[PDB]
Amino acid sequence: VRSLNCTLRDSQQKSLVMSGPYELKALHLQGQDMEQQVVFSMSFVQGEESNDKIPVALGLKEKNLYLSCVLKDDKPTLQLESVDPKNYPKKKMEKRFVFNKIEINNKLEFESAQFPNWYISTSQAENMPVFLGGTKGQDITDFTMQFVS
Numbered sequence: 831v832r833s834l835n836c837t838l839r840d841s842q843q844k845s846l847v848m849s850g851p852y853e854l855k856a857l858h859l860q861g862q863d864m865e866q867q868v869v870f871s872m873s874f875v876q877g878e879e880s881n882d883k884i885p886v887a888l889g890l891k892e893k894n895l896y897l898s899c900v901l902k903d904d905k906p907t908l909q910l911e912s913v914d915p916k917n918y919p920k921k922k923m924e925k926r927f928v929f930n931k932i933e934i935n936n937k938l939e940f941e942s943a944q945f946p947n948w949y950i951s952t953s954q955a956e957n958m959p960v961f962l963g964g965t966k967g968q969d970i971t972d973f974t975m976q977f978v979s
């Protein structure tokens with residue numbers, strides 16, 4: 831499986847950082863604190879694809895953790911899920927790990943492959959969790975990607 835290392839920023843230009851072991855949060859970041867931003871390994875996985883819709887998994891660089899979409903208290907929910915490090919990343923990632931990376935107007939949306947029309951989202955307010963949202967409103971669902979060495 832092929833992977834690229836990257837960071838993500840939402841379209842309000844908030845960076846993503848760890849909020850405890852199994853949550854991300856989004857905040858405006860610049861300067862020295864830049865290094866606290868999460869580096870992803872974006873893997874290009876099996877699934878239905880088009881010019882503008884590319885299935886990916888989002889693992890945390892050199893951690894056995896992946897963003898995962900599951901029902902929690904009966905709602906689609908974003909979580910950070912641990913995996914066996916000897917078996918990941920792999921080309922046939924389980925559906926809960928797969929996001930359709932969609933380019934629209936020079937930005938990126940990450941739709942859950944498991945839960946159609948639910949998206950990786952951030953709040954307008956600073957220091958709030960990254961979450962799975964079913965509305966494209968006040969919540970932000972557009973991102974840019976930055977390549978890292």
Ligand SMILES: O=C(O)CCC(=O)Nc1ccc(Br)cn1
Nearest residue numbers: 839933936937938973974975976
């Ligand atoms: O993220 C930034 O503001 C700079 C890097 C950048 O241009 N990233 C980018 C551009 C177009 C798309 Br689509 C996704 N990511």
Ligand SMILES: O=C(O)CCC(=O)Nc1ccc(Br)cn1
Nearest residue numbers: 931933936937938974975976977
């Ligand atoms: O996946 C895509 O089509 C967009 C990716 C993209 O344009 N990324 C990017 C990253 C850094 C810089 Br600088 C410019 N563009």
